[PDB]
Amino acid sequence: SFSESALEKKLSELSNSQHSVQTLSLWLIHHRKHAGPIVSVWHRELRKAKSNRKLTFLYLANDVIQNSKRKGPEFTREFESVLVDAFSHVAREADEGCKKPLERLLNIWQERSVYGGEFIQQLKLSMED
Amino acid sequence: SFSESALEKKLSELSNSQHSVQTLSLWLIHHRKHAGPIVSVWHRELRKAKSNRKLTFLYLANDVIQNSKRKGPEFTREFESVLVDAFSHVAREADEGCKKPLERLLNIWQERSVYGGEFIQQLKLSME
Lengths: 129, 128
Prior knowledge:
Two copies of one chain form a homodimer.
Chain A: H1 4-12, H2 21-30, H3 35-48, H4 54-68, H5 74-79, H6 83-93, H7 99-111, H8 117-128
Subcellular location (chain B): Nucleus
Organism (chain B): Homo sapiens
Protein name (chain B): Regulation of nuclear pre-mRNA domain-containing protein 1B
């Protein structure tokens, strides 16, 4: 159920601006000429990350991918080869409650043509098992 | 400049996914039948938030508004009445160097028709 006190609590828990997903995503889109190495590091660090941060990696990817389009094709292109594994890993190893977030995110990807519906279905499937 | 080691440190500084903007956004959208009260609380808390966290409030407003469109117009309508003071407040009272990130945010809103050009121009004007 909604409550204002729950909202106040949740708002108090948001990140400082410097460390937000959005701030990081800006610095990465800026460094889009390093997109391959960025995705390689992202991917390795995902597997090292504590289970309470793992979903945050895909939130970062969501942000970077969608907002990079207006700049150029690098991040869409480079992230493609790691997302099946990432989605599988997060769904299997991250903290509880990633499913609805990840489903929703994919439905939005599809609706906004972030990737083709074909690849969106492999991502869905990679969470299935 | 970019380095893999700087990236590594930045990634280790990501928030708990349970507290992240994109999680809170899902929750707020799910509770859109309460958008009015939600925005009031959001607005009051923004005004009490540390200067190093105020911008994150607008990053939340950004995620909520964009992703709420596909569900309904509540968040677009309700946020509309507070965003002029919100942008003026964050530009005036948040840590330096929020202007470039906010300007970009407004560009994206304009590009994706989150609000009309006239209203985006008023939001841009509220910061200078």
